[PDB]
Amino acid sequence: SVYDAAAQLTADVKKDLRDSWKVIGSDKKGNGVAVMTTLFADNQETIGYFKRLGDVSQGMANDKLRGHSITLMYALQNFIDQLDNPDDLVCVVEKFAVNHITRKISAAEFGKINGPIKKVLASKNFGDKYANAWAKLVAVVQAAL
Amino acid sequence: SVYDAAAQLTADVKKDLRDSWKVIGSDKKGNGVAVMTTLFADNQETIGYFKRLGDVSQGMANDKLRGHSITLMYALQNFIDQLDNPDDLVCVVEKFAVNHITRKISAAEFGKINGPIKKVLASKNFGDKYANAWAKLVAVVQAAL
Ligand code: HEM
Ligand code: HEM
């Protein structure tokens, strides 16, 4: 199932993911926080999953939120580095899904991250072409949930 | 405390961490699996914590172990990237400690990773000076458990 979703990651898709990551991943703290705060803004209900982070309205200034945001970017860094080897990408994606499955985060719930990522990409001038590429990467993770 | 331990990362310690990581971090899959296999070999008692991984003796052939090993290296990548800012290093370490605290991994238990790291370092011509540098970094995490 995860292997099938990984099959959608064509040569052109991987190319756009890498080029866009070269910029997005250059500032993990800045963009990581941008993704989370945007998620909470467009889908307030997702905050129910982050009670441990405390006052998320503080954004960057919130140490726990900042810690989470930075760490989130290293999961994406991981995925991006394994793109050329489906076997490694799959094992890393399934490993990643373990904790999210335990948190009872469905594929649909996880997909709510697509909007934030699309917006962050647009702030760096990466159009729909790139947003679609990232939606496909997220789809690989969704297949594991 | 974690804040006092982070202050132990002096200038030369950070430098040695970077220089050694430049090599060790070049092959996250290979070195990551070596670290885990060494841990299970020198400290068989820790295998109980990894029941989900299955037959750990399969090494690289075990998809779950390989996935975990690769992911582990990205946590270290995270720490290394935060060496410039103590505030970020701390929030990232505390974030990382959450799941390990939940698994009831004590500071003493976590410290068993020092042996494996030292051996992997040695296999790449990096001696005691570097093993001690990494022990200090591991100490920051121990302070958070
Ligand atoms: C591409 C998007 C995402 C990435 C790369 C990502 C990455 C991570 C990482 C690396 C962790 C730390 C390791 C762990 O405990 O699993 C984590 C924790 C977590 N994730 Fe995800 N995640 C993503 C999306 C989501 C979404 C959409 C939700 C929920 C709506 C979610 C909820 C959580 C929660 C609740 C935690 C624990 C936070 C804490 O208490 O510190 N994640 N995620
Ligand atoms: C350099 C030290 C270590 C690093 C960088 C590291 C890194 C990680 C990472 C990134 C994860 C995935 C996220 C999470 O679930 O928290 C993880 C999972 C885990 N770690 Fe640690 N860890 C280290 C040492 C240890 C040690 C010494 C133990 C046990 C004595 C331990 C036990 C666990 C367990 C049981 C899991 C879950 C594995 C699974 O079921 O997939 N870790 N660790």
From Swiss-Prot, chains A, B:
Binding site for heme b: 100
Protein name: Globin-1
Subunit annotation: Homodimer.
Record localization: Cytoplasm
Entry keyword annotation includes Cytoplasm: yes
Protein family according to the UniProt entry: Belongs to the globin family.
Keywords: Cytoplasm, Heme, Iron, Metal-binding, Oxygen transport, Transport
Annotated Pfam families: Globin
Main location group: cytoplasm
Species of origin: Anadara inaequivalvis
Domain of life: Eukaryota
Domain (Globin): residue spans on this chain: 8-145
GO molecular function terms noted in the UniProt entry: heme binding; identical protein binding; metal ion binding; oxygen binding; oxygen carrier activity
Keyword flag Metal-binding: yes
A single Gene Ontology CC term: cytoplasm
